[PDB]
Amino acid sequence: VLYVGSKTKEGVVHGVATVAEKTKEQVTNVGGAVVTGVTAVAQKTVEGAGSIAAATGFVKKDQ
Amino acid sequence: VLYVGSKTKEGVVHGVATVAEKTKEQVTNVGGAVVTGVTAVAQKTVEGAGSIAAATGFVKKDQ
Amino acid sequence: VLYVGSKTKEGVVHGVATVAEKTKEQVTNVGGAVVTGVTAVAQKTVEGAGSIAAATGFVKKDQ
Amino acid sequence: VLYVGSKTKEGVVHGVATVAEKTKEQVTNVGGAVVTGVTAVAQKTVEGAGSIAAATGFVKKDQ
Amino acid sequence: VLYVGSKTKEGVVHGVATVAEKTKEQVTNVGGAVVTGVTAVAQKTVEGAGSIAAATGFVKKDQ
Amino acid sequence: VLYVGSKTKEGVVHGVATVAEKTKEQVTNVGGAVVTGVTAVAQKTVEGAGSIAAATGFVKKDQ
Amino acid sequence: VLYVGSKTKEGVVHGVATVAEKTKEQVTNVGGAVVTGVTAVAQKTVEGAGSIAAATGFVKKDQ
Amino acid sequence: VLYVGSKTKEGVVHGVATVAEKTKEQVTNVGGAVVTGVTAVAQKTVEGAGSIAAATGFVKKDQ
Amino acid sequence: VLYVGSKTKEGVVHGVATVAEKTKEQVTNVGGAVVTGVTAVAQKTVEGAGSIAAATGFVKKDQ
Amino acid sequence: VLYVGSKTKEGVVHGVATVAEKTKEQVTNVGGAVVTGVTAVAQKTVEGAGSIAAATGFVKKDQ
Amino acid sequence: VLYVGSKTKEGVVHGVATVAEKTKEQVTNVGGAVVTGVTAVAQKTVEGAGSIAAATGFVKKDQ
Amino acid sequence: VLYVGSKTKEGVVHGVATVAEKTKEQVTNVGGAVVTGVTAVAQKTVEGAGSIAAATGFVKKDQ
């Protein structure tokens, strides 16, 4: 009768409606990174890092 | 009868309606990183970092 | 009667409706990386990193 | 009566409807990597990294 | 009565409907790698890495 | 009455309907690798890496 | 160049989002007529009568 | 160049999102007529009568 | 160049998303007529009457 | 160049997504007539009457 | 160059996705007539009457 | 160059996806007539009446 995990609900998306009417959508980049329009996204992570809609232009490194 | 996790609900999105009417949407970048329009996004993270809509132009490093 | 995992529901997406009417969608990049429009995406990760809609333009490395 | 895994439901997508009416969709890149439009994607990972909609333009390495 | 795996359901996609009406879809790249339109994709991975819709333009290596 | 694997269901896709009406679909690349349109794909992997819809343009190696 | 009907837009509903969270909805009548909850309703009528959400309990007639 | 019907748009519904979460919905009538919950309804009528969500309990007639 | 019907769009429904999560829906009537939940309904009528969601309990007639 | 019917679009439904999760749906009537849940219904009628979701309990007639 | 029927599109349904998850659906009537769940229905009628989802319990007649 | 029927498209259904997961569906009537679940139905009628999903319990007649 310990009930450590008796009911959990974590990282959950439910019941989403979405309408997008777009007469002209233009995404043109140079040298860069564009993220457009994610919907109903739901992750869980135990012991780690999570970047859902991430966008980097440059990543460098030295000694 | 300890009930450590008797009911949890954490990091949850539910019941979302969204309408977007866009006659012209133009996203044109150079050298950079644009994040546009995330919806109904729900993560959980145990022992880590989470940047949902992140955008960097430059990341460098030295000794 | 320990009930360690009596009921879990984690990293779940359910019940999503999506309508997209797009008369012209143009994604033309040079040198870069564009992520467009993910929907109803749900992962779980134990001991690791998860970037769902990630986009990088440059990744470098030195000593 | 330990019930370690009595009921789990993790990394699950269910009940998704999607309509996309696109009169013209043009994705033309040079040198780069474009990810367009994933839907109803659901992974699980034990001890590893998962990038669902990832896109890189350049990956380098040195000593 | 240990019940280690009494009921699990993990990495599952069920009940997806998708309609795509596309009068003209053109994907022409040079030097690069484009991923378009995956649907109802569901993997599981024990002790490994899984990138479902991944796209790289360049992968290099040095000493 | 140990029940280590009493019921598992992992990496499963079931109940998918998909309609695609495409008046003109043109995928012409040079030097690169395009993945278009996978549907109802479900793998499992014990002790290994799985990239379902992967696409690389260049893979190199040095000492 | 008369332009009798150059542009009309009449009886039009567009761009509506609605969320209803109802823990208990009970409609029990005797002898009568209940109309509950219409949304995004738009008619036009030339030479006639239109009652959109109408409800009558009794209608009689004599000589 | 008379342009009697150059552009008309009449009796039109477009771009509607609706979410309804109802834990218990009970409609039990005797002798009567209940209309519940119409959505995105759009008619046109030339020379006639239109009652979209109508509900009558009794209709009688005499000489 | 008369253009009597140059462009008409009348009685049209387009772009509707709807999510209904109902844990218990009970409709039990005696002697009567219940209409529940129509969606995305669009008629046109030239020279006649149109009742889309109509419900009558009794209809009588005499001399 | 009269153009009586140059472009008409009338009585049309297009682009509808619908998700219904119903744990228990019970419709039990006596003596009556229940209409439940029509979706994406679109008729046209020239010189006549159209009742799309109609429901009557009693219809009588005399001299 | 009269163009009486140059382009018509009337009574048309196109692009519909529908998901219905129903754990228990019970329709038990006595003496009556129940219509449940029509989808993507589109008729045209010239000189006549059309009742798509109609339901009557009693129809009588006298002199 | 009269073009009476230059292009017509009337009474047409195209591009429909439908998923129905039903753990228990029970339709048991006495004395009556139940219509359940028609999909993608499209008729045309010139000079006549069309009732697509019709259901009557009793039809009588007198002098």
Question: Can you put this structure into words, describing what you see?
Answer:
- By secondary structure, chain A is mainly beta.
- Chain A has one domain (about 1-63).
- Helices cover about 0% and strands about 35% of the residues of chain A.
- Chain A is built from no helices and 5 strands.
- Chains E and K meet through β1 of E and β1 of K.
- β2 of chain C pairs parallel with β2 (about 25) of chain D.
- Chains A, B, C, D, E, F, G, H, I, J, K, L: It is found in: Cytoplasm; Membrane; Nucleus; Synapse.
- Chains A, B, C, D, E, F, G, H, I, J, K, L: Belongs to the synuclein family.
- Chains A, B, C, D, E, F, G, H, I, J, K, L: This is Alpha-synuclein.
Write the layout of secondary structure elements.
The structure is a homododecamer of 63-residue chains.
Chain A: E1 13-22, E2 25-27, E3 35-36, E4 44-46, E5 53-56
> What is the oligomeric state here?
homododecamer
Helix fraction of chain A, binned, reads under 10%
Distance between the termini of chain A: 55 Å
Mass-distribution shape of chain A: flat
Region (4 X 11 AA tandem repeats of [EGS]-K-T-K-[EQ]-[GQ]-V-X(4)) (chains A, B, C, D, E, F, G, H, I, J, K, L): 1-31
Subcellular location (chains A, B, C, D, E, F, G, H, I, J, K, L): Cytoplasm; Membrane; Nucleus; Synapse
Sequence repeats (chains A, B, C, D, E, F, G, H, I, J, K, L): 6-20, 21-31
Protein name (chains A, B, C, D, E, F, G, H, I, J, K, L): Alpha-synuclein
